[PDB]
Amino acid sequence: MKFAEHLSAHITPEWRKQYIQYEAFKDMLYSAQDQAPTVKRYFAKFEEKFFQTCEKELAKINTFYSEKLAEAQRRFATLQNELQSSLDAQRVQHRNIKDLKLAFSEFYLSLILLQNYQNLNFTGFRKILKKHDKILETSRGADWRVAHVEVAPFYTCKKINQLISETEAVVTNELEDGDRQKAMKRLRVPPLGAAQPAPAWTTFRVGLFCGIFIVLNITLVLAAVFKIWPLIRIYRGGFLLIEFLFLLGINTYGWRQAGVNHVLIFELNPRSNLSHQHLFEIAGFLGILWCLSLLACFFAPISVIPTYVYPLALYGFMVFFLINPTKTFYYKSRFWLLKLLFRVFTAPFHKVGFADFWLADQLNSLSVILMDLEYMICFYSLELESGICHKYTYGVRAIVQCIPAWLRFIQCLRRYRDTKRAFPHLVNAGKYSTTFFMVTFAALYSTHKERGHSDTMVFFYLWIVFYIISSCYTLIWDLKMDWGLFDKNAGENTFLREEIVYPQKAYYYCAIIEDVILRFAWTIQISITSTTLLPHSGDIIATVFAPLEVFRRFVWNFFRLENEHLNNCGEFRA
Amino acid sequence: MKFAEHLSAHITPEWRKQYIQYEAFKDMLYSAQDQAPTVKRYFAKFEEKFFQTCEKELAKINTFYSEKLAEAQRRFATLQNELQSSLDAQHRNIKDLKLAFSEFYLSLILLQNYQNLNFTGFRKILKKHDKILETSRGADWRVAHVEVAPFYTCKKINQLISETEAVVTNELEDGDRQKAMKRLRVPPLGAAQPAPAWTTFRVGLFCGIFIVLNITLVLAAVFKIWPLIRIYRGGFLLIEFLFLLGINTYGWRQAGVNHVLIFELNPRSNLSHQHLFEIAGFLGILWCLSLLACFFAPISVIPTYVYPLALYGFMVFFLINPTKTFYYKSRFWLLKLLFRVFTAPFHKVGFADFWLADQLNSLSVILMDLEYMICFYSLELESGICHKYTYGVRAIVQCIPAWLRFIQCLRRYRDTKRAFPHLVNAGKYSTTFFMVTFAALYSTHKERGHSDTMVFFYLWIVFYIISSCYTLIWDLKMDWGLFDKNAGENTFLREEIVYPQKAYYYCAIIEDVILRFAWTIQISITSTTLLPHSGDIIATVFAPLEVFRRFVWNFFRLENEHLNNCGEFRAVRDISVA
């Protein structure tokens, strides 16, 4: 019924510019009919111009299809050579054959993608020429389609069908022991992008969890206004995790809408990947659990059950929700996340891909959870001078604060060793080491504040200068090296890059301003939380700023993924 | 992919028997493949049997297609005659003719979809046979017979469709093709149309808020001047009825019961079950908020009694909102149906009017609560004067829905002139009048020294038994069409059942048996003062049960009505223009 929306929803992002400009053709036809008042001569001239544009688009489609055909043939030849080599070779062999199977599946997916490209282009050409015929009341569009479009190489080439059949047969005969069902179970390509909406049950569950979360938040606010353990420092981590999951669902939705191929960037399975709806569902469920635990703490209806059981259990459930061996709840994604976390926490011993660095950055923005965990350990170790945990600073607190920065710094060092490109990796390593310097100097100042060493005023100046250095370093890296903004090629996009996938420039400008403000706020919050510093209002400031840090990292995720998709800023791809 | 499910979802329900039996062919293919051990000759014999079955299916499909095409041509001829008559006459007539033309176009599109689906199924099943048998003879059979069958080689339907579009856009749309193809487009129909994502999200959000608010209300009641039960029972029953009606719509869609045709709704624009669910969720959210405000009374200045009224007022406004928003089409249709029902004698009784009258019969508790709240406001504002004593107006208001159904049955008898069904139904509704009147007489005479109260008590018990038996028998035999003599396998049922499980039918029968007596007891208790102590609690408990019973009854009555259309192969409405 409507081909503009169906097409745009089915466009392959990386090939967006190579499809027929159906919307442009619509605008051209509508404008031509709008200016219609000699008159027949003008109509004939418009017809000639329209069909010249059609020929140009058809030629573009043909050249793109020919290039993709050559690429697919080369890929098939390479895959056959690899299969022969693996067969000659036959733990390591199993991994090799699995990688070969994955490569064959990816190549088949590419063939399906280009077949869909061909079908969509032909359908768009036919529909636009039908619209031309209907608007201009002429039977010449069909003649033009039959004369050239019907005989165009892109529509008359069946090499892709033969390649698909050959790939299927080869996989079935040399990778699945002659079973076609198993081969097609992995080769089949379901609808991609936004073509397949999320299940109705998933959306209903997301809505149910959102409603329960909203009502429970209202109830919590009412209980707090009306109505032994620090509840803020125990529940801030959970609240931040829920907020991060919700903002990550928003990030995934925006990436899908803007054509940012985060599936390829994150190296996820394109045939089956988690969507924003599932992230919203998980965030809503975790928020429901968090709200229930906090309400139980506020009320404690059961006396036999101590209050401290409620927080622990909540966070225990969360742990049990992530390390569950059973294949019940997002098991594929949960196992992938577990592997990524293991790689990140063992950063120097694994090659650093985009996913590892991205998760390490997320942890950098989520250090408050580790700080709260360490504070809970301190509370259970000593407090259970009364408030000794938050009144003094120790090295363990500083190293716990710097753990995410340490992980990122070691990742950058490993990347430098692997690639030897000193500039980016070492500049990023220094950016992360500014965090170590700032935290150490803040801890020294806090320790010296208690005793009159006479060298506490000099430790404060060092902390101020290193705070400024770290803030400027992080902001510059975020604006220039992460988002790729402030580029010379952006003639029409001031303070941006040449190409921006997102619709509005206001998004980018507000992002720059918010990045600066919340970078300063994040540095301040890290300074406050790492050490005693403000002994009275520090906790409130940290609690207020941590959600702002999560929001800043969410916007940063948006723009970092955008830059990575447009330009290989992270150099994680060939 | 998954062509069996696609065929099941896209088949026209009334033509279910007339499609290619894809699942049956799959069964034959799988059974033959498993039975494979002389092997080649056995395979050839199975292939011959499969081709014979395919030939039978092709002949049946061709015959059905020819019959439907002939019906379409006759309908087009009649429509052209009506158009000529209208031209000779030359607003309501033009609108009715436009509706008839749109319905004919819908029927043509349905027949074309039937043809395309049958051909695609024939191709898919023959491809499956080729794959399983490792032979290409099925493709040859498809080419020789399926691709040359009259049902697939006849493009007369496309020409008829084009002629219909031209006629509509010329003689009705004033030579505009934009107004045409908007009245007659036939978007995806049946269960093949997914509901909007935002609608599902709103349904979920409303359900979650409703659940949490209900939990809060229960906690407040268990841990923390105006009868709240009477005030809010009507609203709770309305919310429950809306939720169960959404369930009814979902089940009708899944089972293929074409409620759209039975209710005479527009096939192109239908209210999905999720829309009903979200409406019920929002109404329940408002009801829970009002109840919580009554309980806690957060605003001291605002009196408690304002909270319910407002809610109900909003509810009324929600139904009365003249603005073209918030299901304005469905709301206006419901308002017209209600106006027809409450003025039954002066309007022709369709299925929708009788169905809504029955729904109101199951929802008499709302009217009773309204009357009680009128009495309380008039008199109370002798403690409990309204509750302790009853009057004739109470019984009359109780019998109102039964009066509506009885007069509808009388009108149906007057129109059709058939005396069995309509007058037996009228007697079954008059039993309610007798029972209510005798209950009221006994309750009135209990307080006074009539000296014949026991006689009226015995009369009330006799007529209560009579009414319960009458309603139960009518529900089981007439409404649900069960206990039919032609039931071969489905004992105590009819020959053909649209729902997957007969256990559902048996459980529904038992539940109706119990709940008809429960509903009669509830009506007796509410209408009079038989049980002044526990009567209110009994009525409150029974009213949701009455709504559940009228939900199950809706299921089975709609199934029974749809089976008649299935037998008649009537997939579209019969439009008459005056």
Ligand SMILES: CCCCC/C=C\C/C=C\CCCCCCCC(=O)O[C@H](COC(=O)CCCCCCCCCCCCCCC)COP(=O)([O-])OCC[N+](C)(C)C
């Ligand atoms: C400081 C303390 C800890 C801080 C928090 C730690 C971790 C959470 C952070 C990020 C989660 C991953 C975000 C994915 C981003 C990429 C885009 C995308 O959406 O990708 C998703 C990946 O889904 C995920 O990874 C899971 C999403 C998160 C679910 C949360 C589970 C519960 C966690 C409990 C918290 C644990 C600590 C206890 C509390 C103290 C695509 O899924 P797929 O199925 O295509 O996956 C690929 C699978 N193949 C390749 C085999 C097909």
Ligand SMILES: CCCCC/C=C\C/C=C\CCCCCCCC(=O)O[C@H](COC(=O)CCCCCCCCCCCCCCC)COP(=O)([O-])OCC[N+](C)(C)C
């Ligand atoms: C004693 C009090 C009685 C309580 C009220 C009981 C029932 C009213 C609701 C529904 C009855 C009709 C249902 C028909 C069955 C098929 C399912 C379906 O609903 O399908 C619908 C038909 O139904 C409806 O439109 C029902 C409308 C529902 C709107 C909600 C209004 C609620 C108002 C609340 C009242 C407040 C009272 C409180 C004061 C005490 C099909 O949708 P369409 O878009 O094809 O509609 C047709 C529209 N064309 C003709 C243009 C295509």
Ligand SMILES: O=P(O)(O)O[C@@H]1[C@@H](OP(=O)(O)O)[C@H](OP(=O)(O)OP(=O)(O)O)[C@@H](OP(=O)(O)O)[C@H](OP(=O)(O)OP(=O)(O)O)[C@@H]1OP(=O)(O)O
């Ligand atoms: O509205 P009408 O009745 O006057 O004519 C409509 C009709 O064109 P027709 O006369 O056959 O040439 C549709 O064809 P159809 O789906 O049946 O298909 P096929 O016959 O199978 O090809 C077409 O859909 P589409 O197929 O191009 O998506 C639609 O385009 P529209 O919504 O604008 O959407 P856009 O594509 O421009 O975004 C036209 O609407 P209008 O142009 O607004 O008036």
Ligand SMILES: O=P(O)(O)O[C@@H]1[C@@H](OP(=O)(O)O)[C@H](OP(=O)(O)OP(=O)(O)O)[C@@H](OP(=O)(O)O)[C@H](OP(=O)(O)OP(=O)(O)O)[C@@H]1OP(=O)(O)O
């Ligand atoms: O992703 P992979 O292909 O690299 O690895 C697959 C492999 O196991 P691994 O993780 O390598 O240790 C399969 O068995 P395997 O070792 O005999 O290997 P082969 O496929 O013969 O090479 C296993 O099938 P199973 O026995 O559980 O059913 C499957 O599990 P699971 O997700 O539940 O998926 P399902 O199979 O249930 O769909 C894994 O994922 P996927 O194939 O993508 O699905």
Ligand SMILES: O=P(O)(O)O[C@@H]1[C@@H](OP(=O)(O)O)[C@H](OP(=O)(O)OP(=O)(O)O)[C@@H](OP(=O)(O)O)[C@H](OP(=O)(O)OP(=O)(O)O)[C@@H]1OP(=O)(O)O
């Ligand atoms: O590869 P497989 O074996 O897993 O699936 C095959 C077959 O299933 P099988 O195993 O024989 O039982 C078909 O029926 P099915 O299982 O979905 O149906 P049920 O619902 O159970 O009836 C399936 O869909 P479909 O033809 O019915 O729509 C079709 O897929 P696909 O490429 O989309 O074919 P096309 O639609 O584009 O023609 C494949 O046909 P082959 O070309 O012969 O390989």
Ligand SMILES: O=P(O)(O)O[C@@H]1[C@@H](OP(=O)(O)O)[C@H](OP(=O)(O)OP(=O)(O)O)[C@@H](OP(=O)(O)O)[C@H](OP(=O)(O)OP(=O)(O)O)[C@@H]1OP(=O)(O)O
């Ligand atoms: O569609 P019909 O032709 O069968 O009936 C339409 C007709 O109502 P009638 O019976 O004559 O009283 C229109 O009034 P009219 O004669 O002044 O003018 P027109 O020449 O038709 O424009 C009315 O306003 P309008 O929408 O068209 O401007 C429109 O409302 P509806 O679409 O609901 O509302 P919205 O689209 O605004 O939300 C009705 O659409 P139906 O939904 O199908 O009933």
Ligand SMILES: CC(C)CCC[C@@H](C)[C@H]1CC[C@H]2[C@@H]3CC=C4C[C@@H](O)CC[C@]4(C)[C@H]3CC[C@]12C
């Ligand atoms: C108050 C100010 C400082 C905060 C910074 C502005 C916020 C509101 C801006 C910064 C980046 C923006 C996002 C950037 C990209 C997208 C993807 C798009 O498909 C939908 C909108 C969405 C999701 C934007 C929403 C608004 C947003 C979050």
Ligand SMILES: CC(C)CCC[C@@H](C)[C@H]1CC[C@H]2[C@@H]3CC=C4C[C@@H](O)CC[C@]4(C)[C@H]3CC[C@]12C
């Ligand atoms: C009270 C005791 C004796 C019996 C209770 C039986 C209830 C649970 C039975 C009676 C009628 C049944 C319904 C009959 C028809 C359908 C439609 C189907 O597509 C889904 C199930 C559904 C919705 C059934 C669910 C179960 C049901 C509601």
